[PDB]
Design a protein around this motif. Structure first.
Motif, short mmCIF file in Angstrom:
data_model
loop_
_atom_site.label_atom_id
_atom_site.label_comp_id
_atom_site.label_asym_id
_atom_site.label_seq_id
_atom_site.Cartn_x
_atom_site.Cartn_y
_atom_site.Cartn_z
N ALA B 14 13.66 6.66 -60.37
CA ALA B 14 14.00 5.90 -59.21
C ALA B 14 13.27 6.27 -57.78
O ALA B 14 13.87 5.97 -56.96
N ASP B 15 12.20 7.01 -58.05
CA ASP B 15 11.45 7.15 -56.81
C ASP B 15 10.62 6.27 -56.47
O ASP B 15 10.03 6.21 -55.38
N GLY B 16 10.42 5.19 -57.17
CA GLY B 16 9.42 3.89 -56.98
C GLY B 16 7.97 4.41 -57.44
O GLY B 16 7.03 3.93 -57.03
N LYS B 17 7.79 5.59 -58.10
CA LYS B 17 6.66 6.27 -58.46
C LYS B 17 6.54 5.87 -60.02
O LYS B 17 7.26 6.01 -60.73
N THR B 18 5.23 5.49 -60.19
CA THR B 18 4.86 5.15 -61.68
C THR B 18 4.35 6.48 -62.42
O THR B 18 3.45 7.34 -62.21
N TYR B 19 5.71 7.12 -63.06
CA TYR B 19 5.44 8.33 -63.85
C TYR B 19 4.96 8.04 -65.20
O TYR B 19 5.47 6.83 -65.69
N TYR B 20 4.02 8.78 -65.85
CA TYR B 20 3.66 8.27 -67.01
C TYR B 20 4.21 9.40 -68.12
O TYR B 20 4.26 10.67 -67.97
N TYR B 21 4.62 8.78 -69.14
CA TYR B 21 5.22 9.68 -70.32
C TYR B 21 4.32 9.69 -71.66
O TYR B 21 4.02 8.51 -71.94
N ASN B 22 3.70 10.61 -71.78
CA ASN B 22 2.44 10.78 -72.71
C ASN B 22 2.94 11.11 -74.05
O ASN B 22 3.65 12.13 -74.28
N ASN B 23 2.58 10.42 -75.11
CA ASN B 23 3.04 10.55 -76.38
C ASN B 23 1.55 11.54 -77.00
O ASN B 23 1.28 11.03 -78.28
N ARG B 24 1.16 12.65 -76.39
CA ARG B 24 0.38 13.34 -76.81
C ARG B 24 0.89 14.27 -77.99
O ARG B 24 0.84 13.83 -79.23
N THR B 25 1.46 15.34 -77.49
CA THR B 25 2.18 16.31 -78.32
C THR B 25 3.55 15.98 -77.90
O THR B 25 4.50 16.91 -77.95
N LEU B 26 3.81 15.09 -77.01
CA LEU B 26 4.97 14.70 -76.14
C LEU B 26 4.70 15.37 -74.88
O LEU B 26 5.00 16.57 -74.81
N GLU B 27 4.13 14.51 -74.04
CA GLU B 27 3.62 15.19 -72.68
C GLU B 27 4.27 14.36 -71.51
O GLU B 27 4.41 13.22 -71.67
N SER B 28 4.36 14.76 -70.12
CA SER B 28 4.71 13.86 -69.15
C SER B 28 3.54 13.95 -68.17
O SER B 28 3.11 15.00 -68.11
N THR B 29 3.48 12.94 -67.33
CA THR B 29 2.46 13.00 -66.19
C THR B 29 3.07 12.45 -65.07
O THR B 29 3.60 11.32 -65.18
N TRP B 30 2.95 13.12 -64.03
CA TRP B 30 3.42 12.32 -62.75
C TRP B 30 2.40 11.29 -62.30
O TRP B 30 3.02 10.34 -61.87
N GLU B 31 1.38 11.60 -62.29
CA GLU B 31 0.46 10.52 -61.70
C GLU B 31 -0.49 9.96 -62.85
O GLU B 31 -0.35 10.48 -64.11
#
Lengths: 9, 37
Positions: B14-31
Motif C-alpha cells: 500500500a506504499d505504492g512501492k513495487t516490492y518483490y517477493y522472491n521464491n528463492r528459498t522464499l525471500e522478500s526484496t524491497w527493490e
C-alpha cells in the motif's frame, strides 16, 4: 480472492 | 560462469512501492533484486 502481501524486510 | 534469476514477482504494498517477493528459498526484496537481470 486476491492474496495479501507479506511485508518486506 | 552463469548467473541466476530467481522468482521475481510483483508484490507491491500500500506504499505504492513495487516490492518483490522472491521464491528463492522464499525471500522478500524491497527493490529490484541484485539478481534482477
Amino acid at each position: 480472492g486476491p492474496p495479501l502481501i507479506p511485508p518486506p524486510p | 560462469g552463469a548467473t541466476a534469476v530467481s522468482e521475481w514477482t510483483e508484490y507491491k504494498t500500500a506504499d505504492g512501492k513495487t516490492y518483490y517477493y522472491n521464491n528463492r528459498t522464499l525471500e522478500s526484496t524491497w527493490e529490484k533484486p541484485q539478481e534482477l537481470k
